[PDB]
Amino acid sequence: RKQTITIAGIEVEAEIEGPPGFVTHQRDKDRKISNPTKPYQNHTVNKILSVKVTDKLKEQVAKDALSGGNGYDEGVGLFNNSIFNVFKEEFNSGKELNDILSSLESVARQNSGAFQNTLERYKKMLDSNNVINFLKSEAQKEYPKLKSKFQTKNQEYIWLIANLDQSKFTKIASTSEKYLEKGLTISPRSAFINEAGEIDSNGWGPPDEYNTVTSRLRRDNSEYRVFDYDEYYSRSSDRIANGTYPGWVKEDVSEPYSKKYNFKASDGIRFSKLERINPNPAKGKLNSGLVLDLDVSNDEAYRRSKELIEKLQKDGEQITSYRIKNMGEKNSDQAFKDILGALPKDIQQLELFFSDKATNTASLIALENKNIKELSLYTSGNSLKKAWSYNPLALRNTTWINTIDYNVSAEYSSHDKITTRITFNTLAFDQEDFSNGSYERINDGLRMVYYARNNEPFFQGGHGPGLEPDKKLGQNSYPTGLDFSRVTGIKSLKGLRFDDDLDTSNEPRKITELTLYNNESYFEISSDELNEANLQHLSTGEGNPEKPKIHFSNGNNTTSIRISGKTLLSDEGRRNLDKYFEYNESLRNSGKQIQIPNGSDELKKQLEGWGYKV
């Protein structure tokens, strides 16, 4: 304990602390609901509690923020970024002081987007104030006779920044000292100057040896991928499309297999083989493998499908992976439980490219006893769309799920197909899960993605892992909604459990969207409303302005909530009864409730019992 580490090329004494261990209970192992082999761990490298800072280091953090350091930011630092080098180059040409116009023609026009955000790095100090005149190189004899001569503020700012004095700026500001005492350097790519002539930033970073997300990706790309690679990088959207990996070369080898399996060139079947650029002499990882595509929306590869995947066993063959491309792109109901069930007992990779137009996750993989699991749930479209859902039990014994190849961002043009992993944010249980009218199996899956596996980066979605993902799981993201639109028995949240074993040390989970099975113009709920859960449904609530959503499979059932049985409703019964309108955009037409003609009719605001549509 109390070792020394080089934070910024300079050795400093630090409170480096042990990385947490993910405690896996025997209930997780005995219910078959842990990750199946070598439990995944999020923080592969240490946190820093504090660095005992010294002037020798906080000086270098300024020299780095000014110069661009000597790493990834070495070219967008505060006094050698791209815009500042276009001015400092032109100002060294011999032209008279009127030449600021030639830099004005370089801050509008095609450069207009790049100057406005790079100017703002200085403009938080460079504005009209008495303090700036100390921070020019030697121009104290050139500024106060020139203020009235610039033809616009967009000239005067350029003549400012081209003549700031680098050796004056060696001072870190207060907020970026506390982040350095926590062990983080300023990132030169976002450093900016404040009014007192001192440096802070919109962004920081740890030293790379202690960088959690870079060390997680540098491990997961090395072990879990089947086709491993050494970098922290995501795959590019076109490497996702072309079935190709960093450090691997892909051969199409289809035509020799076409001689054996009678598929013609147009059919939407290809074989490819991946081999490494350098083979690895070690045991236990592939030096080559096969990827078979099945472009199922071509039709020919959907007729020639189930028989093919099994022919590719009985020929005496050992395929590493499959690319079920364009699932549903030509007709939305397209069935797959037979084809996706046809696979071996061990699978290394699956690329399932779902259609955005289908949104149809038929992926009940039916417990293929292990996947070494480059199980990737990719799409050719809007991968954040709130209609995406997955069955959690369908992943039970897959060792990893692809959540590194996330590519979607604001850049891409309208007319080209991006490709990315899905941000799954809802769970879709299906009709065989609620087996004999008991919640036993749904409480394995609904504990799987909320506790037993909730330190893996896939069982998380649109908040990622939080602070200490292996020890305070209550802080992590989780899939924020339930879809029961395919399991006809479930009328409510009854018998579902959302805190595991130690209810103080992790937050009880909550949900935000709930879709329920329904078919007729009404929805009928009977008397489970006394034991149905309210406190599960409040939308990540701190006193939240927004509301949860409740939906139905048929989207138009306005008539009423219908109610049956002898039982008179308790205090909690009125609470749960209100939540079926309060959260229910399909049904906020005046709170109408049809109690059947039997029993007391004990309420004020409730209807007769007849329900025929006019």
Side-chain angles (χ1 to χ4, degrees), residues 1-372 374-614:
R1 206 170 182 237
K2 290 187 64 61
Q3 58 261 44
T4 54
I5 178 59
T6 55
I7 295 299
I10 289 172
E11 301 70 30
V12 294
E13 298 72 16
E15 304 298 331
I16 307 303
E17 187 56 68
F22 182 37
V23 293
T24 301
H25 303 101
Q26 285 294 336
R27 180 181 173 188
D28 310 332
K29 185 173 285 290
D30 197 19
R31 291 301 305 175
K32 198 189 186 74
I33 211 60
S34 182
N35 184 296
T37 60
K38 286 73 175 73
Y40 184 98
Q41 193 147 266
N42 199 298
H43 287 325
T44 85
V45 287
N46 304 72
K47 189 173 177 185
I48 310 191
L49 301 174
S50 184
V51 169
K52 177 166 285 197
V53 296
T54 295
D55 193 18
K56 187 176 180 183
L57 172 63
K58 44 183 161 180
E59 177 71 20
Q60 188 65 49
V61 175
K63 295 309 217 310
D64 286 7
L66 295 160
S67 313
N70 58 24
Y72 194 96
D73 307 1
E74 191 208 322
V76 190
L78 181 63
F79 295 134
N80 53 249
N81 65 69
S82 60
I83 283 291
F84 190 98
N85 278 287
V86 169
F87 305 140
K88 184 164 61 173
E89 180 189 68
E90 189 57 25
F91 277 54
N92 291 6
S93 186
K95 301 173 186 168
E96 76 296 339
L97 183 57
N98 196 276
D99 83 340
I100 322 297
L101 177 59
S102 71
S103 294
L104 188 150
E105 197 166 320
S106 190
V107 300
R109 208 167 51 76
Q110 194 64 33
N111 297 87
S112 53
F115 175 80
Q116 181 58 79
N117 84 302
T118 312
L119 174 66
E120 185 65 4
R121 303 184 64 179
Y122 314 103
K123 201 171 188 291
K124 294 173 183 181
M125 179 279 290
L126 215 79
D127 64 11
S128 184
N129 67 63
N130 180 256
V131 184
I132 196 173
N133 194 40
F134 182 57
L135 308 174
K136 302 210 77 180
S137 58
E138 208 207 327
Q140 292 71 28
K141 296 94 60 168
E142 299 186 1
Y143 187 29
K145 304 310 182 195
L146 192 67
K147 296 185 181 184
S148 55
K149 310 309 190 297
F150 299 112
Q151 299 94 68
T152 176
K153 302 304 93 171
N154 280 10
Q155 288 188 352
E156 189 261 18
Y157 292 150
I158 295 172
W159 183 84
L160 258 294
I161 71 180
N163 282 180
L164 260 55
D165 191 10
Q166 297 198 211
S167 193
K168 299 280 176 48
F169 292 99
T170 59
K171 191 182 301 190
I172 300 307
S174 311
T175 186
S176 303
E177 184 167 34
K178 177 53 66 193
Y179 275 57
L180 183 67
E181 288 175 355
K182 293 173 63 170
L184 310 174
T185 53
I186 288 178
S187 168
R189 178 169 269 279
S190 61
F192 79 85
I193 309 171
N194 79 57
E195 296 91 330
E198 51 170 45
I199 305 185
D200 48 276
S201 184
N202 302 312
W204 293 262
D208 194 308
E209 182 174 303
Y210 300 77
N211 188 296
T212 168
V213 179
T214 308
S215 189
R216 190 195 307 139
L217 274 45
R218 188 185 292 140
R219 189 203 60 199
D220 283 17
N221 293 331
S222 183
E223 305 320 307
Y224 290 113
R225 300 208 69 147
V226 192
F227 303 109
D228 67 80
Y229 62 84
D230 202 26
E231 298 92 338
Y232 75 90
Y233 310 154
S234 300
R235 298 199 299 147
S236 307
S237 179
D238 202 49
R239 291 186 190 256
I240 299 175
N242 297 1
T244 301
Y245 283 80
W248 295 85
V249 55
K250 183 193 91 295
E251 297 177 277
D252 277 4
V253 300
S254 55
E255 305 315 287
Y257 285 115
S258 86
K259 197 188 200 295
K260 290 291 185 176
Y261 314 140
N262 288 1
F263 65 93
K264 281 76 186 174
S266 190
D267 295 4
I269 297 136
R270 291 167 44 234
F271 289 72
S272 319
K273 175 183 144 290
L274 281 69
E275 70 176 41
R276 299 177 185 261
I277 297 300
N278 305 92
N280 181 2
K283 188 68 64 167
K285 276 178 270 276
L286 285 301
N287 282 326
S288 289
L290 289 91
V291 66
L292 167 68
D293 86 11
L294 289 168
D295 193 353
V296 302
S297 290
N298 194 50
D299 195 33
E300 274 85 311
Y302 184 79
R303 180 179 180 234
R304 305 239 72 110
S305 63
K306 187 190 187 295
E307 60 88 37
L308 192 157
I309 292 187
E310 296 182 42
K311 184 168 285 161
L312 275 295
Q313 297 180 183
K314 68 168 184 182
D315 191 34
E317 178 61 278
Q318 64 197 31
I319 287 188
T320 315
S321 66
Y322 312 83
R323 331 181 73 223
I324 323 301
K325 263 184 61 60
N326 298 29
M327 284 178 69
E329 274 289 302
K330 189 56 58 181
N331 209 86
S332 310
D333 69 328
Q334 194 174 144
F336 301 109
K337 286 188 176 183
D338 292 346
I339 297 160
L340 186 58
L343 282 286
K345 210 85 171 187
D346 57 292
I347 324 166
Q348 319 303 49
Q349 156 184 267
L350 285 181
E351 311 180 50
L352 304 187
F353 295 88
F354 296 91
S355 179
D356 175 356
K357 303 192 75 172
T359 193
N360 199 345
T361 317
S363 76
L364 184 68
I365 285 153
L367 313 188
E368 310 294 20
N369 186 279
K370 301 292 168 292
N371 286 352
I372 307 305
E374 166 66 283
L375 169 55
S376 60
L377 300 170
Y378 297 138
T379 49
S380 307
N382 189 348
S383 84
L384 288 90
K385 183 178 191 171
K386 295 173 184 175
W388 290 118
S389 62
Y390 70 101
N391 184 272
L393 297 158
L395 304 177
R396 184 189 281 255
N397 49 18
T398 66
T399 53
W400 184 90
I401 306 96
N402 193 318
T403 188
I404 290 181
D405 297 352
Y406 178 64
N407 270 263
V408 55
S409 69
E411 184 232 315
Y412 303 91
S413 41
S414 181
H415 54 79
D416 57 310
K417 297 295 198 293
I418 66 171
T419 301
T420 175
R421 78 85 165 197
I422 299 162
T423 296
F424 281 104
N425 215 335
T426 276
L427 304 181
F429 298 98
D430 76 342
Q431 186 58 97
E432 52 266 46
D433 290 329
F434 188 48
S435 60
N436 64 250
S438 187
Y439 308 93
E440 191 190 329
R441 199 182 200 241
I442 294 181
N443 281 291
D444 295 325
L446 199 63
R447 187 169 175 284
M448 198 187 80
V449 310
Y450 289 174
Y451 295 101
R453 302 188 65 182
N454 186 240
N455 81 320
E456 296 193 47
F458 178 80
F459 299 113
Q460 287 192 345
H463 171 106
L467 290 172
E468 49 186 296
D470 304 308
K471 182 155 57 74
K472 296 180 184 153
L473 280 74
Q475 301 292 45
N476 296 346
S477 196
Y478 44 81
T480 63
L482 306 180
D483 174 1
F484 297 122
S485 192
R486 62 178 69 170
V487 53
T488 65
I490 298 173
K491 288 169 284 285
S492 58
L493 274 61
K494 185 182 89 80
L496 302 187
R497 296 179 289 273
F498 296 75
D499 59 347
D500 61 351
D501 302 283
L502 298 170
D503 67 349
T504 56
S505 63
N506 286 302
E507 304 199 342
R509 302 305 185 181
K510 305 291 157 61
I511 73 170
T512 71
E513 179 172 281
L514 173 65
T515 306
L516 302 182
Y517 183 77
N518 194 68
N519 67 327
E520 187 45 64
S521 312
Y522 59 75
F523 159 97
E524 181 152 290
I525 190 155
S526 195
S527 194
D528 68 354
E529 301 187 326
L530 292 312
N531 212 2
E532 177 176 40
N534 54 356
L535 76 158
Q536 268 55 265
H537 216 307
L538 206 69
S539 181
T540 312
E542 80 291 357
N544 190 347
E546 79 201 335
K547 56 176 61 180
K549 289 190 171 183
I550 295 178
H551 304 292
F552 303 111
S553 308
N554 62 327
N556 82 100
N557 59 308
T558 191
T559 293
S560 281
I561 299 297
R562 311 213 315 187
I563 304 178
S564 68
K566 296 184 179 185
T567 308
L568 189 142
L569 306 184
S570 313
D571 186 4
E572 184 70 347
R574 294 179 185 177
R575 313 295 166 162
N576 289 327
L577 178 56
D578 182 20
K579 307 329 172 197
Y580 275 87
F581 303 97
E582 191 185 338
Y583 307 150
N584 196 345
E585 311 314 328
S586 188
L587 191 56
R588 289 195 300 100
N589 298 325
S590 302
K592 308 283 285 207
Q593 303 142 55
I594 295 169
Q595 186 172 11
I596 61 178
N598 320 71
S600 308
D601 305 335
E602 70 280 6
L603 254 63
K604 184 58 178 182
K605 313 298 181 181
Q606 99 295 21
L607 259 61
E608 174 59 17
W610 287 355
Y612 299 112
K613 236 289 184 180
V614 294

